[PDB]
């Protein structure tokens, strides 16, 4: 009985994970990353 | 300084000399940054 709920919580977890990964990958594929090598003299 | 005083020119040249010597920068930095709280100076990637 434990393997069903383990596989369910695991599948759910990795589903959240891949949805997040894909979403953020599209986000970085869109935003153009806002690249800034240096900011201040302290840097 | 008072109009046409005898102190205008010397304090003027003084201000310039101090600014060039770095006294002004160090002093301002002293009362603004050196004495002051939360001095992280953009730490932990605050800009991004």
From Swiss-Prot, chain A:
Induction: Down-regulated in the pyramidal cell layer of CA1 in the hippocampus by global ischemia. The postsynaptic actions of L-glutamate are mediated by a variety of receptors that are named according to their selective agonists. This receptor binds AMPA (quisqualate) > L-glutamate > kainate. The chain holds residues 617 to 659 of 883 of the full protein. This is Glutamate receptor 2. Homotetramer or heterotetramer of pore-forming glutamate receptor subunits. Tetramers may be formed by the dimerization of dimers. May interact with MPP4. Forms a ternary complex with GRIP1 and CSPG4. Interacts with ATAD1 in an ATP-dependent manner. ATAD1-catalyzed ATP hydrolysis disrupts binding to ATAD1 and to GRIP1 and leads to AMPAR complex disassembly. Interacts with GRIP2. Interacts with GRIP1. Interacts with NSF via its C-terminus. Interacts with CACNG2, PICK1 and GRIP2. Interacts with GRIA1 and SYNDIG1. Part of a complex containing GRIA2, NSF and NAPA and/or NAPB. The M4 transmembrane segment mediates tetramerization and is required for cell surface expression. Ionotropic glutamate receptor that functions as a ligand-gated cation channel, gated by L-glutamate and glutamatergic agonists such as alpha-amino-3-hydroxy-5-methyl-4-isoxazolepropionic acid (AMPA), quisqualic acid, and kainic acid. L-glutamate acts as an excitatory neurotransmitter at many synapses in the central nervous system and plays an important role in fast excitatory synaptic transmission. It is found in: Cell membrane; Postsynaptic cell membrane; Postsynaptic density membrane. The chain crosses the membrane at residues 1-21.
